[PDB]
Design a protein around this ligand. Sequence first.
Ligand SMILES: *Cc1c(COP(=O)(O)O)cnc(C)c1O
Ligand SMILES: *Cc1c(COP(=O)(O)O)cnc(C)c1O
Lengths: 396, 396
Amino acid sequence: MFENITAAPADPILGLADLFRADERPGKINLGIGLYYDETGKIPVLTSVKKAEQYLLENETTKLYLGIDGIPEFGRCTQELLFGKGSALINDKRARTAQTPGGSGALRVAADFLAKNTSVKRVWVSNPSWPNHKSVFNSAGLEVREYAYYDAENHTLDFDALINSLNEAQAGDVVLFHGCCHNPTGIDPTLEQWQTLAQLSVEKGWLPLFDFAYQGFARGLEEDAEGLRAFAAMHKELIVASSYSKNFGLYNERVGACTLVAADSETVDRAFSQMKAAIRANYSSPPAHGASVVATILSNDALRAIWEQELTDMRQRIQRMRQLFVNTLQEKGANRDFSFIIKQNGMFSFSGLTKEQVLRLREEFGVYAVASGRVNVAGMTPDNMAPLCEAIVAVL
Amino acid sequence: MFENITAAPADPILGLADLFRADERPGKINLGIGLYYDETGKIPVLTSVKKAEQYLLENETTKLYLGIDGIPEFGRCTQELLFGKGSALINDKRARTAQTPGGSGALRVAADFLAKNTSVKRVWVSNPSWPNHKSVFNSAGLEVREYAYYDAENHTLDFDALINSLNEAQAGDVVLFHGCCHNPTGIDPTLEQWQTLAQLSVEKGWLPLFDFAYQGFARGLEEDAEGLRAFAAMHKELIVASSYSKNFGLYNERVGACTLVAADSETVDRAFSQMKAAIRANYSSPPAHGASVVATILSNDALRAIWEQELTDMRQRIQRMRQLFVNTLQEKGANRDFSFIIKQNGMFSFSGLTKEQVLRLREEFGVYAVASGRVNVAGMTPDNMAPLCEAIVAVL
Ligand SMILES: *Cc1c(COP(=O)(O)O)cnc(C)c1O
Ligand SMILES: *Cc1c(COP(=O)(O)O)cnc(C)c1O
């Protein structure tokens, strides 16, 4: 029955980790997958987290199934993180949150939900975008179309080209936005542009879906939510697929959430009940661990304090790594100018190397980047910075 | 966009959880959802589990993403527990295992895989069956048909009906089987009946799918795997969705596995690549916690010894509650004769109660059972047995 199955091509991201973990080369450098690395080159468990886990070890008394939608407290905290402590969304009880296995699980949950309870047929994703977006949506039976975004010869956000592209989107179409830290470009809309898109989308009748996986890595917690918050003030309905993988260093515990908003309580409850049915036919209930971690920290004043500090440290190192990177490129006598890299934000930088420069960088020097030329700046360290820049310069 | 969404009906199982939580009557009794309770009435965290957890707290240095298929050790152990220590399956390298978020997530992973890579169009589930089977499969765009199973009158396995009904399954159809501890009848075939079924299925051309969620609750780890093992010797291709939720008391951590078997190593490999693609478009990678716990305990001779005893205790306690239940029923007044209950395996007995009788026990005596009349014997304690057998008798 399987005699005919065809071999799938491997994940452009997840697949590279396999090649990586296979070269027996001494000085290999991994700048592919979106992990945060410290000065010493490791991917540490944060301390606030270790503290939270200790607490859990002492205090848990049962492993009793969670409800479909997970931990209440977790949902509450996510909302305020998301909309504000103040908010009317929260005040009017307009939103409902489901804890899912990572922000990947939330995307799928939303897709399954949309495909089965709405008249949605297409979803609009930026170009370029996170490669898994297409697979998730196609998996639910939805079609994906792209909208212009990135201005390659200037490394910018091509606003009108983005807007003109969107004019092709019909009313009732889904349009996907990246909260902040655009993956893989690192180019984000300003607050004005966010406001414009908000208005437009209200006129054109689109349903907004925000992919929020980097809250806190651009400028800060509250200010990273600005774009989302502007949309929220104008819309009656929207979906937020959020992740705690990067901001809590909880990658393998799978912690994310799916937030549903409707014009009002009665509607949202009705709507959510179906979202629940979609979950039940998937993984049933969500994994407690990582989510208990996040709820514990967000719920405790001390731990939260530590956590925020650990987060601000993460963000700053990355910003340091980015200046260090171009300066060194410079000193190493790089052809082009790479100063645009200083303007982007988050873990990734769109380097501008070609398919075959990245292919070369790898076969030849053990430097691992994603085919699109996306580079993980958080994987860079003062110790690997020269060898790195020396390889790049050698291929350009 | 969400204005016309209709409210979903509640889950026969999970839904009761909700009502239970909200019921304020003091002496309530829960015999709904499949959770193991102790003499004192709690869902405790096993000792071997708390140990393994301590070990993790101390030894973990990273939260790094696991791979699509999870922790290699986990899969290795799972295959041994499943096929036995030195199986040819393991030796020939025919099976491949993916770690999933519970047995639920394994079921779904298999459905998505099947629906997309094979020409499978329909799935055969027993009557009666675990309510969620239907939903998972339908979600994948698969048809679910039913096969005769239980004989209500003499409360037993009707082999002819079972056999005669399958007679309509076509070649290339999936036939789903319960490893042991039939949910919800508690009626399992004999080894001899297992052997018969194993021959038909081959002759007839079916693709067997085993739902294995109660390994260890019938007779023992190995004994419990017989039917599966007999199937494994004749078949070329097989699917296994297993759960560690009940045998490890790890309910909310979501630990399960999906094992894919092919005629050979190359085929299975090729096939598994697709299964992996299906997972990437779903939740990406699995939750580390509970799986780490399982691998830790299975790979350490000492922790393993403790666990197997903990598990033996569970099974034993349950069988005690069985006989206590009938005796008390009788000596307390019952009209009917519930002795058939002594011959079922697992957490659950099919009580023979009416939809009206279960509604009533709920509404009137605070006793929670599932509408089909399935009761959780493992939710019964020596302290609640009195008031319980009284409620029942009063509705007879
Ligand atoms: C990492 C990432 C995701 C998926 O997040 P997980 O929490 O790892 O499932 C989704 N979208 C973007 C833009 C991401 O960077
Ligand atoms: C419990 C159970 C499952 C799913 O269990 P998980 O909690 O997701 O591991 C599947 N099938 C049967 C028959 C079960 O009893």
